[model samples]
Every structure is written in structure tokens, then in C-alpha cells.
Target chain A: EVSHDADSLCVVIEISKHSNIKYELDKESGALMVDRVLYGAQNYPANYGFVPNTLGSDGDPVDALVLSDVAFQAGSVVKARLVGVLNMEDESGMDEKLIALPIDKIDPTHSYVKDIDDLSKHTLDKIKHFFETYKDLEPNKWVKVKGFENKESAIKVLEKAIKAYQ
Target chain B: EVSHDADSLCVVIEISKHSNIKYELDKESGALMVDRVLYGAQNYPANYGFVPNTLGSDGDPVDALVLSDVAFQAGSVVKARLVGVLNMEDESGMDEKLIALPIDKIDPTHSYVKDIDDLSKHTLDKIKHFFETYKDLEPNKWVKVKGFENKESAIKVLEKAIKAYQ
Candidate 1:
């Protein structure tokens, strides 16, 4: 349950366990949406400011793509195909590794383990091998995934991975 | 893309990858409605034939409550306050490691990676500690959990090892 004051955006987004959360996206307008909104989140903190600023390939701020409130059903299967160029900085965006996540997208039936722990625990090395398998997953390519689904309409992206094989 | 001929109390309600799926619980009848189809599937299979087998408190199916589609979003979160008794097994339910999976209610996004393979590349032992923590998670109590905010939500759950502490 947290938020961020994007001085640049000028709009306050809310966040909670599965409410008032947003994701940073690499888009032209650099938009944000409401993923989930919790009750009494009018007081959620904006200090952490979204999913927090993780390091990007160019060593710059990866824009937070804010998700707005969307009705989600329990026990239904939702799907979202990746739609942008993820610069992994030589790190592997391997087959099933996660790119970003909103708090509202947590699955209740499953163990909430992130890739960082998954890699070290199971030795999958997710970020380590993403580039190796998905060199052409530059933009608009659907990476089949299950579990928590985002509400944004699929926007086909068009870009090239800098490290893509020639 | 797949379905079973199962006519028992178990029915695999399926939808499409391109459809917005939902489930409705009839408040009056306490019946389940998934994707506009009242889970009247009992007649299609056999009414009341699928007697609620494992009371959960006294047996171990997968040791996890089935989650709704909305809860599995990458950034999704939920605060479920359980108020009843639930026991997955008694003194002896089965010695198999209870596994939790972030699975597609219908079609799996990726191939159902049954045994640990390159696609999964993870093992049961590495995640042993997590399952052990929830070893005594008794039902009827509230247990809170964070989520798979990163990339590991795509793999087969040998068992749900949530960092639940209440």
C-alpha cells in the first residue's frame, strides 16, 4: 500500500495490497493507469511512489505505468501479453520471468514469490537468461503468461531490442 | 485449448484467451456462476454428485484455497480475512508435498510444466523452507501475504510457500 508524487505527472494515484497500485511503462506519452484501489486508500503513501524506481538498462528511471481500478473476479483466469521493448542490459528476460507487477495482481492461491528469490532459490537465473531466449521479443510479441492479469487493453508495441541477434 | 471429459463433481470451465472472464455467486442459491454460465454444471455432470469431498481441515488436496482471476494479476493484492475453520489434513492426509500453483483456471499460458524441466528449471527442495513455514497454518484464522510482484509467477507451484505471518 504505497504511492509516489510524480511531480512530472501532477496526478496522485493510490495504492494498496491490491488496490491503488501502478506500473512504470516505457511509452511515448508515459502514461499511467489504475490497477486496483483499496478502501480508505485516500491516505496511502506516495513516498515510495508506485513500484519504486528500479534500475533500467540505460541506468535511468523506468517510467512507472500506473494502472487504474478495474473489476477483477475471483477464480477467473486473466491474461496479458507483454507489449513493449524491455531493455535487459544483457540480463536475460528469460521465457517466463516477470517484467513488472502491480500490487492488486497478486494471486491468492499461489505462493507470492518474486523472480529475485525464485532465481536464487531454484537457480533459474531469470534476469540472467532473458536476453538469451527472447532476443526477438522486442515489441508487440506476445509472451504467453498466466496468473494475475492486468486490465489494460493490449497495445501492440513496435521496437527493436538493441542486443537482438542480427 | 484443452478440456477433460470429466463429468464428476469436477468440471473444468473454460473460456478463451481473448475474452474477459468473470464468475458470479448467486447470493440467494449460493450457486457459482462463471463466465455467464451458472455453474449449474451439476446436471451436466451430476447434481450433488461432487460432494464437497475434502473438508480441507482434515485433508490435503493442494493445501491452498482456489483464487479468483482478479487476484493473480502481476501487481494485484488481496486482504482475505478468513473467519472459519479449515483443515487440509488430519494427522495423516498424504505425505506428498502440498504444492500451490499459479495456474490458468482453464488453459495454461505455458505448457503445464509437470516435472522440473528447462522451462521451469526449479526444484522442490530449494523451496522447502517456505512450505515448512506454513506447516502449521491452521484454518479459521487470518493469514496475510504479499505477492509475486516480480517474474516468478509463471512457474509451477510445487506448493504455496507464502510468507504468511499473522
Candidate 2:
């Protein structure tokens, strides 16, 4: 029953901002589960979760990291737009997380961010920095952030994920 | 009837140093065959081939790039010692090529290179450089060099390949 519009799609939050927990949607049980308390993470940079009706190549729902001033609660489905894609390879192989932002937030200035380039370097660095140090303490795991791709690439990946779901 | 000693293993040369041809052992055909001339590669930096009696996760034999002053012919088995590994993920998933040197060569200065550090920075740069530019013209192919790991890591990977062979 969720929408498929890139500019008005459903993004289900699993972990809120400033949270160290690594929680994700449990497919079989259809509920959010705490996978683990991250070993090398202090707090996530923003609201983190997945896009509904989309399955990534990694065999889970396509991951989405939504940037906003407000912290979202777990299991809260927010209306977000596709903005970019963060390219990174981790222990799980290539986990290319989709970058998104809410269509309309409580704050004024943060509601209408456009493209990947429209975001500040400092903002982008925070997201990249969080992923860099988050896997250090985990045994036999490594993470490499290859920076970001534009909204164009993000949509292509999104379509692939949404296609795979069917 | 070949050896398995990390310090004295047989590496059959498929593509020699400064050659652009991509030739490999044809498993079922029992002869060396040309795969393709690499799209963007001008020349390979070293003698490139695979270790005998071993298979990689990618289905080919474990690749070994031997650094030497002299180039050997295709199908020529050269005695070499494992020194390091160049970790790169390509279109075919993870490809970790083992770096080695001839146990005894005509160039006395090239022999006895004990570890990865024994090689110079400029020497290492050339090897990494060749891989960096080699896949540019190929459609939908990527090459990411994660630098080199120690001889200890190389040996561990070698043992896994050997174990997988049987």
C-alpha cells in the first residue's frame, strides 16, 4: 500500500539519529530487530533504515540513510525523496546505501535539499566519516567508502531494487 | 609433481612483462589460449600467471604476478617465492593476486626479495599503476586496488587456494 514515487516513497526508519544500535527490519518476522550494538560506532549521523518494496542485491531491503534535523523513531514510515547513493564495500560485499531526505520536515530550511552536490562538504563528510570508523572493532570486517553517486544513479539502482522485489 | 613451498612454487607465465596480451591456461583444452587483448592495458608490469594445482574463488587458478628483470614465454613455469598480495575487486568479484619473485634469476639484484617491503615504492607504484589504467576502455568493468598485504597474509590466502584445489 506504500507509494513508489521517488519524491514521495515510504522510508521505514529502523534506527534513529545519535543511536549506536544496528537495528534492521526482520524479513520473516516482519518486525524491527536489534542486530547488534555496533562495536566501533558512537552514534549514527542521521535516521537510517530501508526503502519499502525494494530488495537490494545483498538480499535485504535496500538501505536508506535519511538526513534530517529531527530524530525518527524505529518503525516510523516517513515520506522521503531519493537524493543520492553512498558507494561503499564492507564485509557484506558491495552495500550501496541509498541517500534520501524527507519531503517535508518540521524545520524550514532542511525540507528542500535537491541534489547530492547541493549538500555541503561538511555534511557529506559526516556521513562518510561515520561509516569509516563504524567497522573497526568488528573482527574480520572492513569498510571502504568510495564516496557518492548522483540522484541519476540512485534512481537506476532504486528501479533495479524495486524490480527485484517483484 | 610440482612443489607447494611458498618459497619455491611453480608459477606458469601467461602474460609476460610489458605485454598487452591476455592469455591463460585452457583447463579442458589442455593448452594455453588467448582470452583477449586487454582494452586499456598497454603492458603488464611483471610476469603474470597463476600458481599450479590451486583454484581461486573466481574459478580460475590463483593468480601470481612475478616481478623480474627478464620476461618469460607463455606456459613457462618459473620458480618463485610469495611476497605480498594486491587486493582488488573487479567485474568478477574479489581478485587477490599474489606477488612473487624468482627464487634465482639472471639478475642477481632482483632475487632474494624476501617480503613486500623489500620492494621499493617506485617499483610498487608501477605494479599498482598498470592495474589502475588497464580496465578503463572495457565496458562495465571496474578495478579497485586496496594496496598490498604482508607475506603472512599472502601465505594464508595461498593455503586456502591450495586447500580449495583438492
Candidate 3:
């Protein structure tokens, strides 16, 4: 059973288990499948996943980016604490990414990133830059990195996703 | 008379001659009217003005923030070079501000800021912060400092405002 809350986020890890391999959930089979394989670009910046039982504006489970020391395999469930959100816009519309801290390796130092601004500016810039250029190979796909928001805004997005799911 | 174009903008200075006082155009009287007087807050960060013959989302001429070392009086017409845009959203809708560099003092140093990202991150942060808190004294009004965009986006906004004006 997965619990969807700020403190108890059950994230279903998807991509970046190894490298350059994109994994995503199949709607019909409810199984993790290989979406694509990257050729030269860098792997996922963080552990990419999604929160179950939550529907985002893109008609799918809200995407999440768990910042952890280690990567998890696809379909693996990991508990995390919500930290902030990356407000983004694409050709499809809002594709927000909830930033989270994995509960398995919680520490006093990194766990203090309660707000998006609490993270180092370099780290935030890197995350933003990766998203901005990730779709360079795709034709006619546009993604704009709007900005980051505080934890409160992330919670509001989560709440909205929950309502959308229900 | 001033020219309102992407490279050269004609701004009608509204406020910030002295301090803590806001001036706006009186539609019927065709003169700058005293809008309000601030009590404690700091004055406008830059020369506050608007582009004539262009209607913004707020039912007025498109607002512009011209960056100049010196202050300009009300009704003073100045030609400025568009640098970027302060993307903002109030309770009503998008109320973006075109960031410009006055053509009178165009120098090699400041003229290099062709886009919002070209400016130092600190400067951008300060401008965003000012807009976020400028309306703090107002009652029941919420304005979100969305972010900054490049000169191209600013021109697009200006064109849209021009269309709305017609």
C-alpha cells in the first residue's frame, strides 16, 4: 500500500537505475517499461519517479525527483519527504517535479533543505539546465524551466494532484 | 512623442521623481495624476513608466520599468532599449513589465544586457523581490513575481499589447 502525503511519499522509481535508459510505467499493463535509450546525453539528474494515486495536470501520476545518494530500480517503492517543487511548462502544459528526500538515508545536513532556496544555487541551476536541454533531440518539443517554488507550493500541488486522482 | 518598438521603446514616466509617491496618467484629463503616496516603504526601484498606444492586460497602457541612474519626472517621455521583461501575474492576470535601458545613456557596459539571463543573478533577484513585495501595503491584493524572460518574449508581449491597444 502506498501512502501519498508530504511526509510519507511513496515514490515508484522509474528511470536512471543504470544510465541513459529511460523507464516509464505502462498504463495498460501497470508495469515499468523501457521508454527509450539515451545516446549521448547525461542520465537523469536525480532518481526520477512518480507518486502513486495522484494525478497531475498532464493526466498522469505527479512526477517526482528524489535526491538520494543511490539510485533505485524501476518499480521499486521508496518513502520520501517532500522538500520543494520545480515549476515547469512544456508544449503539453505544466509538468511540475516535486523535490523530495529519501527517508532511507535521512541526515541532518541535507535534510535541512525544507525550501527550494535552501539548496545551493548551483544545484538548482544544474537541475534546471538538465531539464531545459533534455529534449534537444526531440523534434518540435519545447520545455521551459519556469522556476522553483517553496515547500508550501509543492504541498499545494500534491493536494491538487490528490483531488485530481480522486 | 516617442517610438514604441522592440529595440527602441517610448516610455511615459509616471512616478519616482522624488520618493514614495505614485503617479499615473489621468485618462480623461490627459495629465499625470497623483495615484498614491507611500508611507514607509522604499520608492520605486527604477523609473516607473508605461508605453503609450499599447493596452496591457490591466486595461491601461503597458507598464515599463526603465533602468536609469537618474530619476525622471512625470510625463517625461524617454526612448529606451528593451532588455528583458519582468514576468508577473496579479489577481487579475498577467501584468508583465518591460525592462529597458534608456537610450540617452546607452553605454557599452549596460547595453550588453541583451536578455534577462545576461544580467547578474543578484540583479534579477532584487528586481523580482521588489515586485513581489511592492504591493504588500495593498489590501486583499496578491501579485506573484513569476520570473524574467528574454528580450524576445518582452517584444512578443509588447506586440500583443499593441494589438490590444488597437
Candidate 4:
């Protein structure tokens, strides 16, 4: 279920913040597997993964990002509140990352944030920068961070993906 | 005067949608002066402007945007309902654009719209797309459209700008 509770979703973390190692859910085996060493110096600015029960625009699991003060390990299913969309795309098209924070009661520094706008400009910039540069070393592949969208829009993406998966 | 009849701001239109000509308020003369032609085909997606008498995140007057079906002319003061933000920054920094629409009763088609989320998903995508590429044609000039913020965050920004101006 997308709803872990009232305002949060069940997101399995695949990569933690500042981590250079990449992980992915094995399409055939249904297990977390190593993807790559991450092609560049940039690392994820937050815990990254996808909602298990949803289908993304890429036909994979719906991508989800949980921004938190604490570093969550891979495969930890944390409840996260959707706050924004880190809208990005690659040659493959529509690689949008749904942005969120762990549930309010669960987060320390991020407990006060309710939406993407509540986040500091500097932190948001750092996160965007990471995504923009992470794929740089992978020759002939590129990623463009389109920008961010607020909670309402993020929810729409989540719901559509949820339905598409089923 | 910033608070124009409750839940709205008095925004003076500087440029209309798809207008290539740029109109800016002359710093000393306080008149709408013709600025240089915009560098590219991308135009102001809405009524490009500022909230009169208020200072923005930048030192200039508070930047405001009114998305509407009807084109409002430069120097026209429109009562705009704050609905969202098109978060952007330039080389100068903090050049955020406050997004809104004409007061609900004043618009024939936008009458039922009460918030940014009430807007069509495609329209929001188009608006954000405009800001992202509008500055790409100019060298040493860059503009980053980070994301969109909901009405509540939009109001928080307007209040601060109002206080700063007063």
C-alpha cells in the first residue's frame, strides 16, 4: 500500500545520502542488487529508492527519495511523507524522482517540514546538483533536472503510478 | 496597498504572455520603460511583473506572475490571488517568481480556481518549462527554475515581502 499511515508512504531505501555505490531491485529475482559504482563523484543527496507497489514512467518501480538528517541503509522500509517532485529526465525520458521526508514524528531536523518549499534553498540546490552531475561520467548518457513541483503535484504522480502498477 | 481587498496583492503587469518585448520599471523614473528584446523565442508565460511597493528576495521589487487566459497590458494593476510560486534563481540570486491568478471573480474561466493544485497538470508543466529555458540563449546568464510551491508557502513569501517594503 502507498499509505504507510495518514500522510506517509512505504518507501524502500536503495541508496543512502552521500553514497557513491548504486543499488537496484533485481527485476527477475525481486531482490536488492548492486547496480553500479555510480559513474561520477556525485552521490545521492538523500536516501533513494522506489515505492514497491507502483510503476514509474520508465516502467520500473516508482522512484522515491527520502530526504532525512539521518542516513538510512539500503532496504530499510521507512514511512515517508511526500513533499515535492525533483523533476528530471534523461535520454530515456521522464525519470522524475518523487521527493519526500520521513514521517514527521520520525524525522529530527526534517520534522518541521511539511512541503518542498519548507526546505532550505542551499540544501535543495545541493540535492539538485547531485542529480545533475551524477551521470556525467557515463559517456553518451545525460540527465536533466527539470525542477521541483509541490506536494499536490507529487501526490498526483504517486497515485497515477500506484494505479499503473496494479 | 500591497493587500488589495484581502487574500490578494496589487501586481502591476510588466509583460504579457508570449510577448517578446521586455518592459521594465525604470529604476529612477519609476515608469514602465521599454527594455531590450528578449534573447529567445521563449516569452513570459503569464503576466510578468512585481507587487508594487514591495521588495523581493532580491533588492528589486517583489516579482509576481499572473497566469490567466486573458492578456493584461503593461502598467495595468491587477488584483491577483496568490496561489503558488515558480521558484527561480539567477546569477544575481533569489530571483523567485510569485505565481498567482486574477481574483477568481474577475476571470471568466479561472473563476472556480482557488489554488495552484486546482490548475491542470499540463498547464503547470508548460509554465515551469518556460522559465527553465528562457535564459539559455544568453551567455554568462543562467536561470534555474527549481520547483513550484503551494498557496500557503506563496502567502508566506508575500507577507515577508510586504513587511520588507513597509
Winner by DockQ between candidate 3 and candidate 1: 1
Write candidate 3's Cα lDDT for B1-166 as tens digits.
Answer: 5577777778888876334578888768887788876422234667888998999888889889887667887778888888888988887887889988777454444766677777776556656756675564466876798898888888999999999988
- Name the DockQ score for candidate 3: 0.01
Candidate 4: residue pairs that collide: A148-B146, A148-B147
Candidate 1 residue-wise lDDT, A122-144, digit = tens: 12223223223443344443333
- Candidate 2's TM-score: 0.49
Sort by lDDT, top down from the best: 2, 3, 4, 1
Name the regions of candidate 4 deviating beyond 4 angstroms: A1-166, B1-6
- Recovered native contacts in candidate 3, as a fraction? 0.00
Identify the candidate with maximal lDDT.
2
lDDT of 4: 0.76
Residue A2 lDDT in model 4? 50
DockQ of 2: 0.01
- Better by lDDT, candidate 4 or 1: 4
- Where in model 3 is the C-alpha error above 4 Å? A104-109, B1-166
* lDDT, model 2: 0.80
- Provide the TM-score of chain A alone for each candidate, in the order shown: 0.24, 0.93, 0.91, 0.92
Tens digits of per-residue lDDT, candidate 1, B7-60, equal: 111212222211234343333675555634322211111001111222222232
Docking quality (DockQ) of candidate 1: 0.04
In candidate 2, what are the lDDT values of residues A54-110, reduced to their tens digit? 899798888898888888998788888888999999987898888988886543456
Q: Please report how far candidate 3 places residue A79 from its true position, in Å.
A: 0.5
